[PDB]
Design a protein around this nucleic acid. Sequence first.
RNA 1: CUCGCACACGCUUACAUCAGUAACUAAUAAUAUACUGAUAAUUAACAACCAAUAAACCAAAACAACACUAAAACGUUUAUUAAUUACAUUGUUAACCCAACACAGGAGUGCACCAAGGAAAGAUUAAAAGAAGUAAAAGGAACUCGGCAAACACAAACCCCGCCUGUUUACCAAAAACAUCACCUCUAGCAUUACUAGUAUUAGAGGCAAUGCCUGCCCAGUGACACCAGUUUAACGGCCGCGGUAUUCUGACCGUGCAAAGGUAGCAUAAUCACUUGUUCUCCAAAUAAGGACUUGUAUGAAUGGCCACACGAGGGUUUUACUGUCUCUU
RNA 2: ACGAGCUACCCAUGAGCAGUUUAAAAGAACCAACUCAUCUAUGUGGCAAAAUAGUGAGAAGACUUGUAGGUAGAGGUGAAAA
RNA 3: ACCAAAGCUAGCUCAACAUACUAAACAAAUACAAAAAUACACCAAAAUAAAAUAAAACAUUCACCUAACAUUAAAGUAUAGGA
Lengths: 46, 240, 339, 122, 393
Amino acid sequence: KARGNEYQPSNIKRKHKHGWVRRLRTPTGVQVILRRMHKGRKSLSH
Amino acid sequence: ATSVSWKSRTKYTVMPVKMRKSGGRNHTGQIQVHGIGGGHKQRYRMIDFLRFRPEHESKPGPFEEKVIAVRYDPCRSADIALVAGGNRKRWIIATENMKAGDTVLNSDHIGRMAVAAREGDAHPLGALPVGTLINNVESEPGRGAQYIRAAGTCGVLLRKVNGTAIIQLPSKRQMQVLETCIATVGRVSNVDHNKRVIGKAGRNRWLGKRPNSGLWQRKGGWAGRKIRPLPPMKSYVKLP
Amino acid sequence: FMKYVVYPQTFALNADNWYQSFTKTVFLSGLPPTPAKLEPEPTLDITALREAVCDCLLQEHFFLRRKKRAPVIQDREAIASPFLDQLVASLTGLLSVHNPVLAAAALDCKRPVHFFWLRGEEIIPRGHRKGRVDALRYQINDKPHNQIRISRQLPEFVPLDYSIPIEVPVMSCKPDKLPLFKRQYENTIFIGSKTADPLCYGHTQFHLLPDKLKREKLLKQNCADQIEVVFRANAIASLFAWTGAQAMYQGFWSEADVTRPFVSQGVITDGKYFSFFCYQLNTLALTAQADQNNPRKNICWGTQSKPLYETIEDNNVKGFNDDVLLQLVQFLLNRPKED
Amino acid sequence: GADRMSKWTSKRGPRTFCKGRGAKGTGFHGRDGKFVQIKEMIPELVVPELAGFKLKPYVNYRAPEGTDTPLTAKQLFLETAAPAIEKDFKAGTFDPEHLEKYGFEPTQEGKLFQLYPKNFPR
Amino acid sequence: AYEWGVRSTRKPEPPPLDRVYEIPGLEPITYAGKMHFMPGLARPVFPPWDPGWTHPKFRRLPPLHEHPLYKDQACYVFHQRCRLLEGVKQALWLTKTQLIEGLPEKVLRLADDPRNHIENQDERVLNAISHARLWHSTEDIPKRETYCPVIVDSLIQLCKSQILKHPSLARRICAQNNTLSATWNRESILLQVHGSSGARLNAKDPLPPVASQEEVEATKNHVLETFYPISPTMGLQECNVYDVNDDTGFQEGYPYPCPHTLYFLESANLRPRRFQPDQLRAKMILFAFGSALAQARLLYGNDSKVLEQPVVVQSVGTDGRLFQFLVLQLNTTDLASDEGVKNLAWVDSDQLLYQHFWCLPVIKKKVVVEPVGPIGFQPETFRKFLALYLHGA
RNA sequence: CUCGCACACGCUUACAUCAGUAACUAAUAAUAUACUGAUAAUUAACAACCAAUAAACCAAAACAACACUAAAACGUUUAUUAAUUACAUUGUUAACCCAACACAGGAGUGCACCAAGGAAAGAUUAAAAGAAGUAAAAGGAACUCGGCAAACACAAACCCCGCCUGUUUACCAAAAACAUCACCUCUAGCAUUACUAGUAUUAGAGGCAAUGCCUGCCCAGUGACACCAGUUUAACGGCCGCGGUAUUCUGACCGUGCAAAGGUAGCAUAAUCACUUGUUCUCCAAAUAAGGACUUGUAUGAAUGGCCACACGAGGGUUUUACUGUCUCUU
RNA sequence: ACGAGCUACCCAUGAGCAGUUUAAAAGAACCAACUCAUCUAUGUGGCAAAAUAGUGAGAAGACUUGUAGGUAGAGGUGAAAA
RNA sequence: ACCAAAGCUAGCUCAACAUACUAAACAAAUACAAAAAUACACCAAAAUAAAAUAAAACAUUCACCUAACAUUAAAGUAUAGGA
Ligand SMILES: [Mg+2]
Ligand SMILES: [Mg+2]
Ligand SMILES: [Mg+2]
Ligand SMILES: [Mg+2]
Ligand SMILES: [Mg+2]
Ligand SMILES: [Mg+2]
Ligand SMILES: [Mg+2]
Ligand SMILES: [Mg+2]
Ligand SMILES: [Mg+2]
Ligand SMILES: [Mg+2]
Ligand SMILES: [Mg+2]
Ligand SMILES: [Mg+2]
Ligand SMILES: [Mg+2]
Ligand SMILES: [Mg+2]
Ligand SMILES: [Mg+2]
Ligand SMILES: [Mg+2]
Ligand SMILES: [Mg+2]
Ligand SMILES: [Mg+2]
Ligand SMILES: [Mg+2]
Ligand SMILES: [Mg+2]
Ligand SMILES: [Mg+2]
Ligand SMILES: [Mg+2]
Ligand SMILES: [Mg+2]
Ligand SMILES: [Mg+2]
Ligand SMILES: [Mg+2]
Ligand SMILES: [Mg+2]
Ligand SMILES: [Mg+2]
Ligand SMILES: [Mg+2]
Ligand SMILES: [Mg+2]
Ligand SMILES: [Mg+2]
Ligand SMILES: [Mg+2]
Ligand SMILES: [Mg+2]
Ligand SMILES: [Mg+2]
Ligand SMILES: [Mg+2]
Ligand SMILES: [Mg+2]
Ligand SMILES: [Mg+2]
Ligand SMILES: [Mg+2]
Ligand SMILES: [Mg+2]
Ligand SMILES: [Mg+2]
Ligand SMILES: [Mg+2]
Ligand SMILES: [Mg+2]
Ligand SMILES: [Mg+2]
Ligand SMILES: [Mg+2]
Ligand SMILES: [Mg+2]
Ligand SMILES: [Mg+2]
Ligand SMILES: [Mg+2]
Ligand SMILES: [Mg+2]
Ligand SMILES: [Mg+2]
Ligand SMILES: [Mg+2]
Ligand SMILES: [Mg+2]
Ligand SMILES: [Mg+2]
Ligand SMILES: [Mg+2]
Ligand SMILES: [Mg+2]
Ligand SMILES: [Mg+2]
Ligand SMILES: [Mg+2]
Ligand SMILES: [Mg+2]
Ligand SMILES: [Mg+2]
Ligand SMILES: [Mg+2]
Ligand SMILES: [Mg+2]
Ligand SMILES: [Mg+2]
Ligand SMILES: [Mg+2]
Ligand SMILES: [Mg+2]
Ligand SMILES: [Mg+2]
Ligand SMILES: [Mg+2]
Ligand SMILES: [Mg+2]
Ligand SMILES: [Mg+2]
Ligand SMILES: [Mg+2]
Ligand SMILES: [Mg+2]
Ligand SMILES: [Mg+2]
Ligand SMILES: [Mg+2]
């Protein structure tokens, strides 16, 4: 019915989907971290 | 991610072990079989299909056991029976007229004389008369009863030639195996399973059958009444 | 609504005084005045009672063969709890001949006692309800080791309007620094049974101290004066909750203040030591709007700790105190009035 | 959405997430679910006697300082072991096989406070 | 056959060794020098790690044959929660006793005598039942694990209330969780009742024998019924480490030596977790037999002989509302041969204290059809319990 | 006037005290839980972390006495090892979360319906038009596509379509669509991750829809088995012309031709091309509306299923009263 | 490359359905909590990038719902609404 | 008269040279859900580049298109091309 509230916060889900261990457990996430470091991001992951 | 199967249990247990159903999902997570999922919570009763299984290797002779209870099993369409003999109990597939407090004999001896086949007996195909009704038939000696198990289904022994037994399966197909294969005489319990009626669409969901898709598919060449010849005999005896 | 959870067996340093502030009860050292109008009844067998007590000691300490306890520390919980149960049962059975009430009494084994009351006011400091007056609520959920419940109430110790020069200690501080913490759950008033139980009165309570409140534990924590304070707080909380449950089962509450005092006896037992308390509830109007002109105060009579045995060794009891046994005998032989 | 620049601490998590603030553990978990604390694991603060110690946290201002000469291995050897080895060599008693008497240690695993493994906190 | 293990969930086989390790006289180059894994180097093989200093918590479990008490002959242990297939039948076979339906004559005479009754018997029993089922807990419907011990202790206190009239019950004391060990060899089978019971009442004075010599001699002509397909050791724990020692719950010089009554409680919320009445009766038979064996072997000796003074023990099992009473008289010790005298047992079974209890008032068609309280009440079960309690005096 | 207390998840100090608000935030002031500065705070008993290895163990939870089918989470005991010695670490505020906002929206659980929470109106006048509510003479659907809305009623019936409960186009379509029990086909004689820890009374790929009467003809074409013949339509799908004839309308009948058969039973102006407002009867004073009959519908038709039937439906049409501002005609 | 914290469907673990008629916990009936959204009127840069009020259907089941996980685009899932 | 407008600086870009090429800080913790001292393992992996465009369409073809051999000529020559 009403949209826009699709983001229901959850720390466990956030850390299991975009956490550091989740990023590093796959080579694609490692490449994502490499791209963020090359760009100079202050926060690489959650 | 990859899921782990629930069947991690090496030791045999009489008590029902809890099982994790998976609806059409393989180890990857994609649907491989459609129309499965959302069933009722069930436990698994460990069934010993190898009927002739002596307790101790010191005495390999035929052994007699006693039926304790005939109970319902949600996993299969048949009704199972707890049978105790020696120092251990086990679940087996109950035949048609097995009741609580019955005698069961399990033998592998073959002689020139056929044994009077009762309903609870488990004798090799070579020791049974030429035209008996059998179930839980075996492929290779010692392999185990993979074949007939469903409620009310039973094959028929046809003939024994050259140390080799031929049976007729419920699909009216002839199966050739060694005469040493252990089989149980009689029909499987719950013969009225074919005559049961599902009262509503909810009973299918209780059994765990998701409704079919609504996509209308036009019938192809596969559709129609295909009158085929009977397939040739399936033989498992490895001729040298 | 929100309420404090008051624990009888507490680890706070000086919690007896805080419990007195919460309860409006005054603590008097020593036994209450003895009603010397008694008949020459106590001709019992002191030797037989000593034999029974020593047999219980030896059975729960050396005779009873249990499973091999790998921790060599030999925790006194599993050593004293069955001992306390068997001692209570044996004493009740032996003294029931002299006291017919104990035969008709019911013995509760580790059955909870719940009480919930109000005391004073408090302006809400934080939240959207800041600046409004909220009454302080307290709840006691005790688990006495052994309880004795009877049919008729025991007689009072002092009259209803008995006055004491000693005043209740009042704290110029919040209860959260005891420390106490607020919690919200079901606030039940429970005596040991439901209201339909014909035994709406009781006789005596038994409380076994936990391993957390051991004398050696307190000494290692550098607490010597708090050994008696632990007993005082336990008795003050438990007996008051028990008498309040009795009064509110009889039908008295803040606006229906109690007409006849409710008396209570309590025995608190460590692994080795014993202590005895007597509590008399007279006033139940502890709320702010009814305590404005309330002169009556609750009274708790207390006794100092006193050991029963001394380093029993190899099925032989070395030391024994007959005065503790006599005090237990008097507590169990106190009888309701006959009419 | 949620914040990423703030540090991930124990306050911003569920009940099942309870992370320490950096303190060292003092024991383990026993049998009945309780925590068993080991007295060997807690740091024992070795404090000296300051009653007869005639030293103050501050120095006299009129007192002079010194030229910065950091201590080094060669200087320490010269102050400690060089005179002894020199005396032994002059007397002819110097033994290259055994140098333990001059303060040298063959292995570190023997003594209590070891250097390379750094068994002492401070 | 059909192996019950699955290759996907079983422990994986170690990966095949690198091709370097099959070359004779060649030293593989691995990553063990850098203490971390790096591709391109061979997999190092490590010897079994040996913790020269043994740690209690983090060491491997010692094998069973290393234990000093390990013995070759497997003993069939019966512990507290053992289940028996043919409960009464296997119990009788393993214990060598003859079963009797009714309670003993002296028990009946003590029970049916109105003089030994309580002042207000029916009212006190109803009050105890109501307190146990409803009043003892703040919850509306208390659980069986709660109201089974409560009702058992309430009945015990009701029986104790008769000590005023009978000044002989003071010779008894209760006991909780005491180890019982009674091992015997029967028909070349080493059985051992070993474990702990719910509650145990002990007394200074022995319980007089109840079986008469006529019944004892008639027991000689009785034959124990046999079950062929099932072995007598069904449901027992086959153990290889044990001690052949008659260890009762107490040490020597105990003041209350003779066990009077065992108390068993089926305090479990689930029917599968509870015992069947048959299995409960078997458990009581075996535990009373173990206690009687301990007493007989501490009084007379370890020799296998017929007892001129039989040892009689009592037991009560409580499901919460169903009571099973048992009086077992051990008369012989030699159980290897089946041609001798058999022990005796009176098993009074399926005794309902009350039919049903309604914790809440059931309302049908806007009216109360049945009020709060137990529907159906059989005081005879309580009378038998009181007779068992007062059997000593 | 009554959505209040607490906990879980989530936000991080937005919480408390003092001081200031000319301006910054409140959609405006007063002042301040929402702005600024300074100082303090949430103290564990509630919660997180809190044994393994073998063996005895089929007997449901629903007041559980004992039973039903869909067969059902939730446990002890025994034996071997489980550092043994106070006080460990962590969450404790809030008027708060997700919606760009101090948003009439979306939010799990335990308690009671107030003993707790708040204010519809910034101040006037009382124009039109608009939204909401109440009441109404006589009439009582005459208004309108439709009785939509409203109403002092809140009933009885007749048809079409789907058996029924249910699901669907989040955000213009909730249905006559899908699914459904039932009935039919086809595809498989079998082992360690789906199917399945199952074995043809089984498991998949599908069609049509309970039940009752039934499902008529055809392998000529295209598919599928058979590796060619031959079998299959509850497979894809098709089931006729021309002309004269009984006594005038018709054609029982005959001649001839092509086909694999030439549309059987049933129903019928239908949700069924156009002619159509087909003809006739009932209902109304009037009817292209509704229902019942006639019926070549040369483009109806039998599991892409054909016919009736109970119950059912916010599905689509038609009536009888009762009801009323829908309307006469608004106030 | 990143997405199943919304939604489609599953997998583990939990929680809810008060009252009334009924031998019934009958994919029964009335009506609450709860879940959907039939009709109308406002709203149409609004309270709202789908709402409010009135009125409706289900309401012991093919029912809702909390937490965690999985199926990722030449695909997933789908009681087919492309 | 408000609103306003104007500075010359921070710094950037293109090259050349150049040591030879992942800057500084790393006391403690950092791939448990990162900044959380501490327990009997599993660790790991490779299989062509495609198309948008041009040929006025589009199927064969379409340089450069993250692979060192640079410069002056041979030479836009021989050849390869739905030629
Ligand atoms: Mg958004
Ligand atoms: Mg199945
Ligand atoms: Mg079945
Ligand atoms: Mg289907
Ligand atoms: Mg379909
Ligand atoms: Mg962000
Ligand atoms: Mg947290
Ligand atoms: Mg929290
Ligand atoms: Mg501690
Ligand atoms: Mg925020
Ligand atoms: Mg302002
Ligand atoms: Mg501020
Ligand atoms: Mg708070
Ligand atoms: Mg206004
Ligand atoms: Mg107006
Ligand atoms: Mg109006
Ligand atoms: Mg009106
Ligand atoms: Mg009017
Ligand atoms: Mg009209
Ligand atoms: Mg008109
Ligand atoms: Mg209407
Ligand atoms: Mg109407
Ligand atoms: Mg009407
Ligand atoms: Mg029509
Ligand atoms: Mg429908
Ligand atoms: Mg129907
Ligand atoms: Mg769906
Ligand atoms: Mg929807
Ligand atoms: Mg829509
Ligand atoms: Mg609808
Ligand atoms: Mg709609
Ligand atoms: Mg349909
Ligand atoms: Mg049919
Ligand atoms: Mg049909
Ligand atoms: Mg047909
Ligand atoms: Mg064909
Ligand atoms: Mg053909
Ligand atoms: Mg017709
Ligand atoms: Mg029709
Ligand atoms: Mg019709
Ligand atoms: Mg037409
Ligand atoms: Mg129309
Ligand atoms: Mg009309
Ligand atoms: Mg018409
Ligand atoms: Mg018509
Ligand atoms: Mg047609
Ligand atoms: Mg058609
Ligand atoms: Mg067709
Ligand atoms: Mg269709
Ligand atoms: Mg509808
Ligand atoms: Mg209708
Ligand atoms: Mg519907
Ligand atoms: Mg008017
Ligand atoms: Mg996920
Ligand atoms: Mg999800
Ligand atoms: Mg209901
Ligand atoms: Mg219903
Ligand atoms: Mg609405
Ligand atoms: Mg209205
Ligand atoms: Mg309804
Ligand atoms: Mg309905
Ligand atoms: Mg494409
Ligand atoms: Mg697709
Ligand atoms: Mg469609
Ligand atoms: Mg379409
Ligand atoms: Mg082009
Ligand atoms: Mg161009
Ligand atoms: Mg183009
Ligand atoms: Mg290209
Ligand atoms: Mg060419």
